[PDB]
């Protein structure tokens, strides 16, 4: 079941390729993470402390 993030991507994903994101909340997981879901339904692990990740989160929240 539960999936987690073990590595973060250091390459920014163009906002246009992002459909959504959720945050890791499970205790079974080791690292804090943001999980972006692409327009192709693919998930990529991202670092919360990074500038591009926060900006991407804003964009996604301000279009709902």
């Amino acid at each position: 079941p539960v999936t987690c993030c073990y590595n973060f991507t250091n390459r920014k994903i163009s906002v246009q390729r992002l459909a959504s994101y959720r945050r890791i909340t499970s205790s079974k997981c080791p690292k804090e993470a943001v999980i972006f879901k692409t327009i192709v339904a693919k998930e990529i692990c991202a670092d919360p402390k990074q500038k591009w990740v926060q900006d991407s989160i804003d964009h996604l929240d301000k279009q709902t």
Binding site: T3, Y6, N7
Partner: protein
Amino acid sequence: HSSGVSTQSVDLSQIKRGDEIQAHCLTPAETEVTECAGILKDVLSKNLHELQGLCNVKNKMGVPWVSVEELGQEIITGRLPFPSVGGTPVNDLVRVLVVAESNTPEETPEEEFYAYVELQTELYTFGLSDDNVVFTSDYMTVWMIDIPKSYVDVGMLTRATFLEQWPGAKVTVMIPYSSTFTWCGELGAISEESAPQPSLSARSPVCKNSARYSTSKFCEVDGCTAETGMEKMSLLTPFGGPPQQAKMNTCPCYYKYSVSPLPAMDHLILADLAGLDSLTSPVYVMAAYFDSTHENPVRPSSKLYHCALQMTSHDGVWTSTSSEQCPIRLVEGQSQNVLQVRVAPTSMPNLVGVSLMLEGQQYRLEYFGDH
């Protein structure tokens, strides 16, 4: 046979001045041969082969004599199957002991027993001069020298030059990978005619084409999923090898490189070994890894570490040594006839390689590179 891999426990407490030898001859200390020469002089004059009791693992190969006519040179050279990545430029040094010896003929030879040993790397050739000598007897010489850990790895060549084809001539290189684990690479000369006799030692790049593991795309094709339990095993032991069977798992590569969500796991199996019910010596497993500390992005400190665990039989029961800093751990498998090398998923990014060493078998599992 002049080839093989052997294990043994090492209790410095039951070895004459074992602590001093370890601190002054196998630890980069005084830049002078005196302190260590003085220890060996006393110890080895009482027991010529005491140094062998310090090898936790001994890997030997048979190398053919290569003749030169004009100077009286019989030369044996070989590429020792170093158990693990030596190190990163950031590491310190390792003090290695080099031993050149042979059988004593019952008939006094015309000349004295001579031997010149050298460890050459692409750029620099570390020679064991007279100034490196820490012990000498009629048919054995011991040299000491500090070399940067990064050099001690595949690439470094071992050449020993003797004046004659001494019976039983052999050169040994004692390489301490940690304070409690020394590995000895030996080169035992054989007939000029015969072909090289390599020990059953292999090096395996478990994550070839690591880019493949950047995502979970090939997870299904590789058999690395929750259902399989992140287990895709492949046989290490060749067809006609010893009665023990070792296997490696390639699924850990995903936890090391995936930026895609992976199934949550308590632990991952890097490898396991079966046939313990008939093994009569201990099994050593050594890990190479970067410490998980947070480092300055401006200056990414790359100090590589090494830890070695030991699985031993006590009254028929196999138990392992434990270690706090060590990322891996050995545990009994489904039964006492099996041992598994485990690790926590989150340790993979920093894991560089693990080596499995036991009676007649050595496997160097690397999680980087494609060669």
